[PDB]
Amino acid sequence: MEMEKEFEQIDKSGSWAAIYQDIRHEASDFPSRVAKLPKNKNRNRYRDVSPFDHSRIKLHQEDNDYINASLIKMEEAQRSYILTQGPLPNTVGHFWEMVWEQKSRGVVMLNRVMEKGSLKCAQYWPQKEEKEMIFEDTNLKLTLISEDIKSYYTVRQLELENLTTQETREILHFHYTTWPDFGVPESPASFLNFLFKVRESGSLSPEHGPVVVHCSAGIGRSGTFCLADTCLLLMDKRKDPSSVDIKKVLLEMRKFRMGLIQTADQLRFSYLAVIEGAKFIM
Ligand SMILES: CCn1cc(C(=O)NCc2ccc(F)cc2)cn1
């Protein structure tokens, strides 16, 4: 079926939970043996969210190459994404090592450091120009260059230096700051505006390594971001845009990381975002 009318048909019939459970039943199951090794317990935020072995990002280190991060490679859309958890106190250095080694231009953050009174990820970037951060375990230096605070999101320019080679690179930090503590946003308008700002920066384009996108577990909000982006790109590429099937795209993405889209409300919100976004594109 088309999307907008399939949408109204699920609303009128109140069957979002049943649609979402079908997706959960059909989703791929692949091994994640490296994630479950005992030496990696303090590298995982949640025991039930792990990268598959076949698609995990490897750190370029011989001691321990593990990080909780997955490469989502979308062949028809010609887009790639790295989806990862919010960094932990003992993985902030690994996080920036990955950004460096994978040649990413942008980092997309969809959570606040504290939500619901609890810490959802480490304070992993510097908050003042004159107070830079040094990650001694991976030999990197990170400096805040500029910050632009808007009503729904903040954009930061950062300098990442590899202290071993003295090479430097400019990294863009796109921080969506207004996702509610409970539920999903009422309108997708500010989320779509944010997606378009990431696109306009070059961070999603083939001349750079894959964008790095995270929230607390790296599957829920993060899944919503890449699902909406890929669906809208496919609607621009194909002769028949009504042929784009959001449930099929989501199942393709779940071949590369488990659990993408965590609730039926997030599924409905993803439909809403793609529907409204397709009208603005034209
Ligand atoms: C009219 C001149 N102009 C150039 C840009 C530009 O560089 N856009 C890409 C970009 C986005 C966010 C960043 F932080 C840095 C770079 C915007 N206006």
Swiss-Prot record:
Cross-link N,N-(cysteine-1,S-diyl)serine (Cys-Ser): where in chain: 215-216
Post-translational modification: Oxidized on Cys-215; the Cys-SOH formed in response to redox signaling reacts with the alpha-amido of the following residue to form a sulfenamide cross-link, triggering a conformational change that inhibits substrate binding and activity. The active site can be restored by reduction. Ser-50 is the major site of phosphorylation as compared to Ser-242 and Ser-243. Activated by phosphorylation at Ser-50.
Enzymatic reactions: O-phospho-L-tyrosyl-[protein] + H2O = L-tyrosyl-[protein] + phosphate
Chain residues that bind substrate: 181, 215-221, 262
Modified residues (Phosphoserine): 50, 242-243
Modified residues (Cysteine sulfenic acid (-SOH)): 215
Domain of life, source organism: Eukaryota
Post-translational modification Cysteine persulfide, affected residues: 215
GO biological process per UniProt: actin cytoskeleton organization; cellular response to angiotensin; cellular response to fibroblast growth factor stimulus; cellular response to hypoxia; cellular response to nerve growth factor stimulus; cellular response to nitric oxide; cellular response to platelet-derived growth factor stimulus; cellular response to unfolded protein
Tissue expression from the record: Expressed in keratinocytes (at protein level).
Chain positions found as Phosphotyrosine: 20, 66
Membrane topology listed for this record: Peripheral membrane protein
Enzyme Commission designation: 3.1.3.48
Effect on the protein upon substituting residue 50 to A/D: No phosphorylation
Alphabetical keyword list: Acetylation, Endoplasmic reticulum, Hydrolase, Membrane, Oxidation, Phosphoprotein, Protein phosphatase, S-nitrosylation
Modified residues (S-nitrosocysteine): 215
GO cellular component labels: cytoplasm; cytoplasmic side of endoplasmic reticulum membrane; cytosol; early endosome; endoplasmic reticulum; endosome lumen; glutamatergic synapse; mitochondrial crista
Subunit structure: Interacts with EPHA3 (phosphorylated); dephosphorylates EPHA3 and may regulate its trafficking and function. Interacts with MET. Interacts with NCK1.
Entry protein name: Tyrosine-protein phosphatase non-receptor type 1
Residue span relative to the full protein: 1 to 282 of 435
